[PDB]
């Protein structure tokens, strides 16, 4: 049993994302096709104390390299962030 | 405050990994260099009930594409799994 519920899925339609520098970049479609595996919360936490403990489930993210571009041109690998898990916050 | 403690880091020395098919593949060094961002548990869970609730923190994984090869030759993109977060189990 988990404290938070999640759902994982294969994302084939991503075309924009925020990179490590906070910029909005275009995520290319091919590299072989470029798709991503993400897992986000579904939606207190299960098994929590609640008495002197408040909790909510939050979906965390992480960095993965993606072949992206900016104002088009400048195509290359950059670190973009995607949903990767669902964790509890007290 | 989180229920489980973790540590994230940049991995530059990965050279082997298990892919989605359960095989052991060689992870190449270059593609630009190929490195990974992972986050694993540090090390019950914080804020848990413990009374009629047992919990341990476990590090979860996820799939990311990596330029890998097998018995060498056959170089290409495959889905390999890496540590991505630390979640509580009841």
Swiss-Prot record, chains A, B:
Function, in words? Seems to promote the survival of visceral and proprioceptive sensory neurons.
**This protein's superkingdom?**
Eukaryota
Lineage, top ranks: Eukaryota, Metazoa, Chordata, Craniata, Vertebrata
Question: So which tissues is this one expressed in?
Answer: Brain and peripheral tissues.
Q: Which family does it belong to?
A: Belongs to the NGF-beta family.
Write the protein's name. Answer: Neurotrophin-3
**Where is the protein situated, by its record's location annotation?**
Secreted
**Disulfide bonds listed in the record:** 4-57, 41-86, 45-88
